[PDB]
């Protein structure tokens, strides 16, 4: 709320929601799986 306090529309929107009703999703960036693509489709990707 402090971060978005100057703005009126943002402030009313955030005020509308309870604190235990908003969640932060800490999606990992690097923790992915192997990229699986057939070599022909990857070559076509690069060429296109």
Between residues 8 and 32, which has the closer beta carbon with respect to its own copies? 32
> By the 8 A CB rule, do 1 and 15 touch?
yes
Identified binder of other proteins from the candidate list 3, 8, 9, 15, rule CB under 8 A? 15
Residues contacting other proteins: total by CB under 8 A: 5
Report the largest interatomic distance among the alpha carbons of the chain, rounded to a whole angstrom. Answer: 54
Q: Say which DSSP state 29 is in.
A: S
What is the token pair recorded at 12? 């009313």
Identified binder of its own copies from the candidate list 6, 9, 28, 48, rule CB under 8 A? 28
Which spans of this chain sit near its own copies (rule: CB under 8 A)?
17, 21-44
């Amino acid at each position: 709320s402090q971060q978005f306090d100057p703005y009126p529309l943002a402030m009313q929107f955030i005020s509308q929601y309870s604190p235990e009703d908003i969640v932060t999703a800490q999606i990992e960036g690097s923790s992915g799986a192997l990229w699986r693509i057939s070599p022909p489709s990857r070559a076509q990707m690069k060429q296109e």
